[PDB]
Amino acid sequence: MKQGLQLRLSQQLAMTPQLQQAIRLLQLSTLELQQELQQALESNPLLELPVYQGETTQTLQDYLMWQVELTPFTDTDRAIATSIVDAVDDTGYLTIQIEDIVDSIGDDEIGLEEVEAVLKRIQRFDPVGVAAKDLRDCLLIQLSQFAKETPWLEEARLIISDHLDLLANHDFRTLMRVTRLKEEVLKEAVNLIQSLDPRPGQSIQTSEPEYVIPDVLVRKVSGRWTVELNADSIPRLKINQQYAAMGNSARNDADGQFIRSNLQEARWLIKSLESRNDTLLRVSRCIVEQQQAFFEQGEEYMKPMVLADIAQAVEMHESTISRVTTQKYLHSPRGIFELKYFFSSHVNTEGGGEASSTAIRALVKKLIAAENPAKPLSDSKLTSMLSEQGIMVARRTVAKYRESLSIPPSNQRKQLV
Amino acid sequence: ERDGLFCARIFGPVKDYECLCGKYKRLKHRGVICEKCGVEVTQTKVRRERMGHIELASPTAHIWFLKSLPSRIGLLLDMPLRDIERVLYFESYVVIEGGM
Amino acid sequence: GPEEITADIPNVGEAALSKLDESGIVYIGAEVTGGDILVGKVTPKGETQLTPEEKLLRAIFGEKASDVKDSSLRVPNGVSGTVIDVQVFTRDGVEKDKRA
Amino acid sequence: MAEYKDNLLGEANSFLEVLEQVSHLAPLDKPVLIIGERGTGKELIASRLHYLSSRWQGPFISLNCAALNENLLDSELFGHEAGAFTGAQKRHPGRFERADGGTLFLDELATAPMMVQEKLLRVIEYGELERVGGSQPLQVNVRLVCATNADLPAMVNEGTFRADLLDRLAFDVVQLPPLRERESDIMLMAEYFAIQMCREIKLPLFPGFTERARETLLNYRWPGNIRELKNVVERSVYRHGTSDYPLDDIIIDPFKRRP
Amino acid sequence: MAEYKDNLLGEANSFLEVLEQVSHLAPLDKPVLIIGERGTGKELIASRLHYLSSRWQGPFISLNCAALNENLLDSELFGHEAGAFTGAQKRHPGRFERADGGTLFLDELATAPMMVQEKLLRVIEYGELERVGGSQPLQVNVRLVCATNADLPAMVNEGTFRADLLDRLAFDVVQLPPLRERESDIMLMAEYFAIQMCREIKLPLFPGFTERARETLLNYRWPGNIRELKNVVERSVYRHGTSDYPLDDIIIDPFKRRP
DNA sequence: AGACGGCTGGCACGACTTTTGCCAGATCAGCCCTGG
DNA sequence: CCAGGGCTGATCGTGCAAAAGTCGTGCCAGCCGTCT
Ligand SMILES: Nc1ncnc2c1ncn2[C@@H]1O[C@H](COP(=O)(O)OP(=O)(O)O)[C@@H](O)[C@H]1O
């Protein structure tokens, strides 16, 4: 039972460089594909009233500059105000700090007190609490703005002054014993703080556009939806008849060989592109077949799958399917997702079955959301009722799902009723 | 896009002082050009004042001349517009020189 | 993400949302003038950054996270009237149907 | 650095002298060799020698020359690179390279065949080794510790051992006194093992020792110095099984019939 | 190549002759055989012999004739090409190919297997070598240096050594004298070694020897030329442990009865 | 006020997935040259 | 003038495997709630 150089065949393989190019041709999205396809089209010669003058809109910075133009500053104050308002984000909080602004001005005469005077002058502009250094001096401006007649104002000012972490950690008991403040009569003061419009500069303009492009289409024909490719998005190449009908006529060997080689390259490229489209269509049809339940019933009713499960259903390889299913967005009546989004890790449940990770994550989302606000549900209890459902995932996986879901811990979301 | 229509490094910067890459984004930089992307840090109103050019490797005629009521090329060469037009589209093969 | 009509509109007063139902659309018979809100629609924004500022804002206030922007349907300026009836259309496969 | 005393019992007379001698060997970086009868607790001192060293944090690995697969001997001794021969899917660390800054335990040098002697003859003096199917050589620094059972000078004259390797590993030799000659700590070793065994059988307490048992202890030749004394104490105390009285009889051989 | 000092403390007439002969043979290209007794600085000579030549800048690689495997013997000697067998995945250089321009220093040639003996002769004579699965002949030039302690004229008569392999390798053999022939220089060696050893063990300064210790170290057989004097002096000074009075205790053999 | 229990997160360890990086050759058919 | 040989180019081919990466689940440390 030895070390010896031995040899026995059971496999086969072969490949050429242009075949490598053709097999990497299907790894990339269509919009990025069209660039390289246009590049090859440029090289190969035998291959191949409207609304205008929109309106100008008023953003936050333009509005603030407009208001600066009608306020009585000096020239130096105007330059400082222009710099300050230039250093303003969409949310309404200035990005760079005051000493950075002073350095940007770069004047010996200019001082921190002068810059503070100008900034506080422009703090009272139409979006209240705009151009604030951080959250601490944005809520305070509006609290000071509100008339003294409304109650709990002093309480709200005391909390917002130097108890910001005390409120952020939702540690109401320590907040009480720190402030010496009233029991459950602080709730309306906290609510007053809540109703204070954080991020005030956002509301100057809120238009967001629609940017969706579908690669694969699925439609419900009264059960067992059939999948079609995007006719407009798909690329296509057509041979050129003029140049295909002049390779034989040419009597020069150079021209003849040139046309022959370019014909060969163009036909190979067309064949490779058609094969890529066919492979993508077949893969999409098979994955939609194996995911018919989820489209009907929702994310939490998703069967876990691996690339092996979808590769065995076809004659392609796991690597081939992995290359095809990158940067492909399929459109469904429920919405737009990615082909790579369907594949997920599996966890074993009670009764021998397995549940998909994304399904359990969505179930955790809805279960956590539908909870009493006074008593939060922790990760251990989440594991407990998941085991009652029969899923029995570990508390570590529960915590990982909750963290990836961006929900803060249970002790962090506790709040007064 | 990079080196195309509606591009940066030509036609000026984009909506604000920030460069395309993301670095060098403030009024503190007033005329500098980033290294990862060549974008002058100036106002975006300059985007309507900066023009580019196309090399056009092969020469090309100008249709405003040689196709107005008089033809400027025709009057310069004493050559009629019909032959000018036939030569300007690769079916006439005019002679340049040759005295021998 | 999909846009939703949930009447959870940020940067707005309680007086503006007085005429809106739970789903976010006006009651039948309400009188509306000028620039009041008819349908409360929100458009999702990018994912909240890990930055401590946004983390603090979420911990303090919550439920906004700058996830949504106020792109609601408002009555055009100088238009006043009383709402006769509304009509809502939902595509197949979508079963939101808040009050549809 | 800590004490690393581990298990130390029955220390008196020449055994204490041996411990005193070996106490200062650890700082040195010269090969050491231990001579002793089979089962004379030689490994205990060899292990403690590594811990008493300044670089006690070095990993400790042990090989027994009596157990070397002749087919895999070279690969185990040096180390094999990836793809050097068929079936080598990944690069595998060799035993010599496995310990760097840590000692290597060698055993049964008296049973080392000429083949292993020649293969290992050079890696010691210069600390230089090249892996089988290797392109470039590696250099390491390891303190070798060896244990044996026979008369290496006698095997040298007999011709089955190489004097070159012997003097390569003959800086100093530690002679462990056999317990049947010391005769000064037999009571202490026996009683210690008795307490351990009676404790682990969850019995209340251990009774004394019978005078007749002491009488018959010294008479026995004791081929097993401290490897069969522990065993006989354990088996005899198990046989008794009670704290009733000091055990009169010691079951020196288990093969003896019950009647 | 201009300046090379390291070790070589011994200074006698017998050593002078061989060290001067090495200087003559160093520029020459022909291979040399280094015969001698165990532990006589054979590596020190071979190393200096190569590095004093005109090809010092070339690579210097050594190997043990016994260490390398018998199964992968040919691959170790020559190397293999990618795809020759299942395991192989890239072209692999052999020792003869890595040692181009430089030297190949075989160690303990007397223990080389019959397989190596019948493998090496044809390539060593002329310079032709075929890589495993190769397509065309390869030609490299390697100055050969070999050293062993055995008696080749007697070995060839026994028949475990190839006659022609010895014949095409034994041009101008080099013989070193045993330690007993140096006479006076052993005191210089002992003084040097003791100084280094006491430096290592942190004692301040050597106190010197005595006339008794001098006579004892002078008059003894010295079966091992060197690496035995080093060991004996370093063990004696270690057992001394202090420099209040001169070094007098001499311990030629660690193998002794318990004190 | 201190200890006990509990909650959460970083790090580690098998077990399993998925991602990229490989780089021709032989074999067959029609045309041209040449023998019968 | 018809049949045999040579020669050149046209044609075929989307998988294997190795290593990086990801997964689930445990172990341990540090902060917090609560009763004594
Ligand atoms: N000083 C000691 N006191 C008590 N027991 C010892 C002492 N030294 C060694 N032993 C015991 O001797 C037993 C065998 O040790 P050893 O002979 O080194 O094993 P090996 O057969 O591997 O050489 C160990 O189980 C150990 O408990």
Ligand SMILES: Nc1ncnc2c1ncn2[C@@H]1O[C@H](COP(=O)(O)OP(=O)(O)O)[C@@H](O)[C@H]1O
């Ligand atoms: N002339 C010398 N000066 C100093 N040290 C020497 C001399 N000759 C031999 N040695 C010592 O001998 C050792 C080399 O042993 P060596 O004789 O090469 O072993 P082998 O005989 O197995 O080749 C070195 O550690 C070196 O310190």
Ligand SMILES: [Mg+2]
């Ligand atoms: Mg043992």
Ligand SMILES: [Mg+2]
């Ligand atoms: Mg040697």
